[PDB]
Amino acid sequence: GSGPKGGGNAVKVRHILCEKHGKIMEAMEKLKSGMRFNEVAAQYSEDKARQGGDLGWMTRGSMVGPFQEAAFALPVSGMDKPVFTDPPVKTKFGYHIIMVEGRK
Structure with a gap:
C-alpha cells in the first residue's frame, strides 16, 4: 500500500x-x-x-x-551506494556504475 505499484517494467x-x-x-x-x-x-x-x-x-x-539482468533484477540504486551488488558491474566493456531510480 505505498503508491500505485503492481507491475515494475x-x-x-x-x-x-x-x-x-x-x-x-x-x-x-x-x-x-x-x-x-x-x-x-x-x-x-x-x-x-x-x-x-x-x-x-x-x-x-x-x-x-546483463546490464538489465542486474539493475532491473535489482531494486532501485545508483551512485556509490547502489543495491546489494556493486556499482562498477561488468558485462561487456569493463565495470560501469548503473543507477536505477524510478521503476514502473
Missing part, C-alpha cells in the same frame, strides 16, 4: 564506465561527496554518461541482457 537507469578502473571510484566518490555529477558522468563514465547521460525510462527486453 521500467526503471530510471544511469551508467558510468571507467576502462582504467581508476576513476570508477573517483566517480563513486564525487557522486557520493556531491561533486560534479555531469563531469564525472561525462568522462568518468568513459563512455556515454550516467548523470547528464542518464538514459531515462528503460524496460526489460529493449535493453540488452
